[PDB]
Structure 1
Amino acid sequence: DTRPTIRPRNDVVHKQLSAFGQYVAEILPKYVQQVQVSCFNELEIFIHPDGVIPVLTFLRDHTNAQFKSLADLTAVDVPTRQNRFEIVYNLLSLRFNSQIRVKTYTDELTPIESSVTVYKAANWYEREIWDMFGVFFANHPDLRRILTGYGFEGHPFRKDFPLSGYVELRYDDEVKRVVAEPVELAQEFRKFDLNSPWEAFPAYRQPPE
């Protein structure tokens, strides 16, 4: 084939995903702000934060969507935006053999309606989002830290949280108990600025401001 290295691209899936994207957009124009199909046939739906519950319920219950499995629930921390956190939902439809992406936005101080009602799988995913990033979710049953140690300060996955953290641990013999101290690395993490100053992909050349 003329493209033995380039990954083949499917247009039929692109058309089916695009048609469904318009379908969902017309169904709930109250929350669906923009929708796009990526080059590698993946659909993303951009909803308003208030539409977290209604949009998910429609995708879960509609006969023409039947997205009945929350694959994962994560957020991407982008400090340059007004709402730095960007909650992302990934759903899979077993009946129609397709996956969808539903993404919202949220600043530091704003609660999001927990999707525990629609997807009981979200319950533990919600705690991770709050623990790693700090996004609080209202109506969550048992919202608490899930991964970080007890009495942990801050939210690690935030881009403004240092990788090495603020506190290390040590067994102090004077108190005969493991204690916490300010971090002091034997060798500091050698940061590597390895971004070439030459443009990589002209396709994503952001127009000048």
Structure 2
Amino acid sequence: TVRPRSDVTHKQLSAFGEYVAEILPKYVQQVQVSCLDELEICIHPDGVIPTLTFLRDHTNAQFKSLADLTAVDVPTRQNRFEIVYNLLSLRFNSRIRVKTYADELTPIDSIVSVHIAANWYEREVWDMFGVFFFNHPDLRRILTDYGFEGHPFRKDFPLTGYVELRYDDEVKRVVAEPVELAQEFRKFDLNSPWEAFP
């Protein structure tokens, strides 16, 4: 019941984290190998295209594929959204996480140039959280309804939205309607008050 882990990795990757931090001192704010044996290089938002280009095209760190781009929203932090890019190196069989912070009104650059995989993921981050990607070809709603107002995955958006749809005979169209739910969603306050010893 304790994961079978290899310490070789923690060390090897930790060493790469120092390598990346040395090669790019201007944009990397903190590098840490977590105990899950994964690496995370946290970069200033301005370093989004530099840091990812170095990883996509460096002989000692080829990170060809963009696994995903997602944005955790911690409402407390001033810069709420924390865009996170997970990248994979087929050559060295290892994976890296580059995460940067973006606020509601401050856009971050688009890596579509570095990886064309991001063309869609960046559109989803805009639709879901409202982060805007600079000089991004065709940014527009990927997942939400054509007329949807509001960014849904933001922690400040109600689970069930504000509008619902129904067919109204009188107008013969699918009309929206302020949300009335027949059974509110019981929100369970299930969270123990005795903290676990770390």
TM-score by structure 1 length?
Answer: 0.93
Q: CA deviation at 1:9?
A: 2.3
Q: How far does the alpha carbon of each residue in 1:32-69 deviate from its partner, in whole angstroms, 9 at most, with x for none?
A: 11000111100000000000000000000000000000
Q: CA deviation at 1:10?
A: 1.5
CA distance in 1, matches of 2:191, 2:74: 19
Name the SS of the counterpart of 1:76 in structure 2.
strand
Q: CA deviation at 1:6?
A: 1.2
CA distance in 1, matches of 2:161, 2:193: 30
Match for residue 121 of structure 1?
117
CA distance in 2, matches of 1:10, 1:186: 52
Name the SS of the counterpart of 1:64 in structure 2.
helix
CA distance in 2, matches of 1:67, 1:79: 31
Matched, 1:141 2:144: no
Q: Which runs of 5+ in 2 are unaligned?
A: none
CA distance in 2, matches of 1:44, 1:79: 21
Name the SS of the counterpart of 1:187 in structure 2.
coil
CA distance in 2, matches of 1:200, 1:164: 33
Name the SS of the counterpart of 2:136 in structure 1.
coil
Q: How far does the alpha carbon of each residue in 1:133-156 deviate from its partner, in whole angstroms, 9 at most, with x for none?
A: 000111000000010001100000
CA distance in 1, matches of 2:117, 2:3: 33
Q: CA deviation at 1:84?
A: 0.4
Name the SS of the counterpart of 2:61 in structure 1.
coil
RMSD over aligned Cα atoms:
0.6
CA distance in 2, matches of 1:48, 1:197: 36
Q: CA deviation at 1:180?
A: 0.1
CA distance in 1, matches of 2:196, 2:165: 43
Name the SS of the counterpart of 2:85 in structure 1.
strand
Name the SS of the counterpart of 1:174 in structure 2.
helix
Matched, 1:15 2:11: yes
CA distance in 1, matches of 2:94, 2:111: 21
CA distance in 1, matches of 2:41, 2:132: 22
Q: How many residues align?
A: 197
Q: CA deviation at 1:111?
A: 1.2
Q: CA deviation at 1:200?
A: 1.8
Match for residue 77 of structure 2?
81
CA distance in 2, matches of 1:193, 1:176: 42
Instruction: Return the match for 2:50 from 50, 54, 58.
Output: 54
Moved over 6 A (4+): none
CA distance in 1, matches of 2:196, 2:162: 36
* Deviation larger for 97-106 or 6-15: 6-15
| Identity fraction in percent | 90
Name the SS of the counterpart of 1:56 in structure 2.
helix
Matched, 1:111 2:72: no
Q: CA deviation at 1:119?
A: 0.2
CA distance in 1, matches of 2:85, 2:14: 19
CA distance in 1, matches of 2:196, 2:109: 40
